[PDB]
A paper describes a structure:
All receptors described to date interact with these Atg8-proteins through a conserved tetrapeptide motif called LIR motif (LC3 Interacting Region). The integral outer mitochondrial membrane protein Nix has been found to be essential for mitochondrial clearance during terminal differentiation of reticulocytes. Our cellular, biochemical and biophysical analyses, including a crystal structure of the LC3B:Nix-LIR complex, revealed that the LIR phosphorylation status is essential for the fine-tuning of the LC3B:Nix interaction and crucial for the initiation of Nix-mediated mitophagy.
The binding mode is similar to previously reported LIR/LC3 complex structures. The hydrophobic interaction surfaces of LC3B consist of Ile23, Pro32, Lys49, Lys51, Phe52, Leu53, Ile66, and Phe108 in molecule A, and Ile23, Lys49, Lys51, Phe52, Leu53, Leu63, Leu66, and Phe108 in molecule B. These LC3B residues interact with Trp36, Val37, and Leu39 of the Nix LIR in both molecules. The electron density of the N-terminal Nix region (PPAGLNEE) is weak compared to other regions or invisible. Given the weak density, the B-factor of Glu34 is higher than that of the overall structure (60.5 and 24.6), suggesting that Glu34 might be flexible in solution. In our X-ray structure, it is Arg10 side-chain participating in intermolecular hydrogen bond to the phosphomimicking Glu34. We present here the first atomic detailed structure of phosphorylation-based regulation of interactions between mitochondrial autophagy receptors and Atg8 homolog proteins.
Author numbering:
A (entry chain B): 10 to 134
B (entry chain A): 9 to 134
């Protein structure tokens, strides 16, 4: 009654922090200026406690990079021990084809907004 | 409905007629892996067309950055057109308004369900 609570207590994902048309606009600008890159959002699964939070959320991935190279890149950015379990979920599932360019993966897995969303965790769910 | 179907003269098969939907889905998979920064474009002459010649080659891997207005110039040159000859490059039956955006951008709005981008060239806009 005395103090007014603003916003919602829970951390918002990227998708949740931006309007659908903001997102669609962000992608337009990327496809226009970085036409050989794929726009990828990369977030730590909500309940995660073994893995650190990435420094950044918004990435541009060269068409040619495959999922296994991406996994290795993110493991290194996060400075993981080689023994630490790590999964990179694309729409809630690990990708089977880890040697196909992300430009191809993008065509099957991209969101309606044009972004490709990934979530990393120490369990595969 | 008692109206007649006036069949066209069967000519050379188009790309979709030569290949099944699954062979084309498979072709796109290969091509996307082999050329991740290119768009696979099928470019064929409008079946009704008289003014413009037929090009020998119909299957083009276009670099993502290339725009529609660069692509048009490429095709007008391969056809060896006179500079006054009307020419249109139709995507799903229409001229593209956006003529200095990357073809990779176009692709995402206009691609066929099989994953190829189809175009048809004509001396009228239809």
């Amino acid at each position: 009654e005395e103090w007014v609570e603003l916003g919602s207590p829970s951390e918002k994902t990227f998708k949740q922090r931006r309007t659908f048309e903001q997102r669609v606009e962000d992608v337009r600008l990327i496809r226009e200026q970085h036409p050989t890159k794929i726009p990828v959002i990369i977030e730590r699964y909500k309940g995660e406690k073994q893995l650190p939070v990435l420094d950044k959320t918004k990435f541009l991935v060269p068409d040619h990079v495959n999922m296994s190279e991406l996994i290795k890149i993110i493991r290194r950015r996060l400075q993981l021990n080689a023994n630490q379990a790590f999964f990179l979920l694309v729409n809630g599932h690990s990708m089977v084809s880890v040697s196909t360019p992300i430009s191809e993966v993008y065509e099957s897995e991209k969101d309606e907004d044009g972004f490709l969303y990934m979530v990393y965790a120490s369990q595969e769910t």
